[PDB]
C-alpha cells in the first residue's frame, strides 16, 4: 500500500460512520502526472483509536480490493499510518451509496435501471469468484454510484463495490447477528464458514434492497428474531416490484453448495 502523508490531507464534512470506523469527505494534496499539482477529492476511512487493534483486518479489506484492477471495483489510493492514525484513503464517489440513492429517488427508479444495477454488481462478483476472491461484505450501502442514469443520451447508471471492512471473521457475534440477513447462515453457525457461497448469499439480500427502495429487509427484527428467522429457514419477502425476487431467492439457498454461479446470476439477468 502507498504510504500517503498526514500533511498531505484534509479532512472535511463526516459522511457517517463504518464499524469501528468514521468516515469523511477529504482532500489530498498530490503530484500527478506531468508533475503537475492536484488538491484532489478523496473518501477516508478512519479506524477508531479504542480500536486499533483491529488495524490489521482494517487494512486487510482494502488490500483485498486492491489485489486485482477492474472498472467496477473503488479504487484504493493508499493508506495514511501517521501518528496515531489509520486511514483509508480511497476515490470519492459522486453520488454516495446505492441504498441512500434507491431512497432518495424512488419513485424514479424504474425496472430496467435497477436490472442494469444488478448486472453491473453480477459482473464484479463474477470478476471476484473467477479470481476466488471473498468479498464478505456485499451490500447496497457498499454499492457507489458513479454516473447517474440519463436517459436523454441511452447513458445507464455506473456502479462500483466498495471495500467490505473489518472481516466477520473477526467481528463480535452480536454485530454479525445485527447483520443478518446479509451475513449468511453458515456464517451465523460458524465465522470461518466464510467462502465464496457468501457472497452469492449476500448478493441475493443486496438484490432484495435494490429491488426495495432502498428498505432493510428484516430491520423490525430484533438480533434474537433474525436468529430465530435463519432457524426457521425463512426467505425475504417478494419485493413489490417482484420482477428478481426468484433471483433472489435461489441466491439465497441455505445450502452454500446450492447457491448458483455469477456466471448462471448473470445469464438469468441477461434472460430478463
Ligand atoms: N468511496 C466512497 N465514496 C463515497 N462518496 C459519497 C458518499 C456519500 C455521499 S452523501 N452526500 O452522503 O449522499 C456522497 C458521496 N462514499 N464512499 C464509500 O466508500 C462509503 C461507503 F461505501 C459506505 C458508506 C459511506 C461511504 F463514504
Redesign the pocket.
Known amino acids: 500500500f502507498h504510504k500517503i502523508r498526514n500533511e498531505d490531507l484534509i479532512f472535511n464534512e463526516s459522511?457517517?460512520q463504518?464499524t469501528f470506523t468514521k468516515?469523511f469527505?477529504g482532500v489530498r494534496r498530490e503530484v500527478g502526472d506531468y508533475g503537475q499539482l492536484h488538491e484532489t477529492e478523496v473518501?477516508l476511512?478512519v479506524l477508531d483509536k479504542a480500536h486499533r487493534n483491529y488495524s490489521e483486518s482494517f487494512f486487510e479489506a482494502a488490500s483485498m480490493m486492491s489485489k486485482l484492477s477492474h472498472k467496477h471495483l473503488?479504487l484504493n489510493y493508499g493508506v495514511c499510518v501517521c501518528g496515531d492514525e489509520n486511514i483509508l484513503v480511497?476515490?470519492?464517489?459522486?453520488?454516495?451509496?446505492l441504498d441512500?440513492y434507491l431512497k432518495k429517488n424512488k419513485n424514479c427508479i424504474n425496472i430496467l435501471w435497477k436490472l442494469e444495477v444488478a448486472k453491473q454488481l453480477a459482473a464484479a462478483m463474477h470478476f471476484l469468484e473467477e479470481n476466488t476472491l471473498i468479498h464478505g461484505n456485499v451490500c447496497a450501502?457498499?454499492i457507489?454510484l458513479i454516473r447517474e442514469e440519463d436517459r436523454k443520451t441511452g447513458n445507464p447508471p455506473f456502479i462500483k463495490l466498495?471495500?467490505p471492512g473489518i472481516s466477520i471473521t473477526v467481528l463480535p457475534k452480536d454485530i454479525l447477528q445485527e447483520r443478518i440477513p446479509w451475513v449468511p447462515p453458515e456464517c451465523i453457525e460458524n465465522p470461518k464458514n466464510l467462502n465464496l457461497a457468501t457472497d452469492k448469499w449476500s448478493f441475493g439480500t443486496t438484490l432484495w434492497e435494490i429491488c426495495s427502495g432502498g428498505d432493510k429487509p428484516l430491520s423490525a427484527l430484533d438480533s434474537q428474531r433474525k436468529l430465530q428467522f435463519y432457524e426457521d429457514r425463512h426467505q425475504l419477502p417478494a419485493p413489490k416490484a417482484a420482477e428478481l425476487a426468484n433471483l433472489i431467492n435461489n441466491c439465497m439457498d441455505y445450502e452454500p453448495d446450492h447457491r448458483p454461479s455469477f456466471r448462471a446470476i448473470i445469464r438469468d439477468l441477461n434472460s430478463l
Open positions: 459522511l457517517g463504518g468516515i469527505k473518501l476511512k473503488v480511497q476515490e470519492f464517489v459522486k453520488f454516495g451509496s441512500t450501502k457498499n457507489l466498495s471495500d
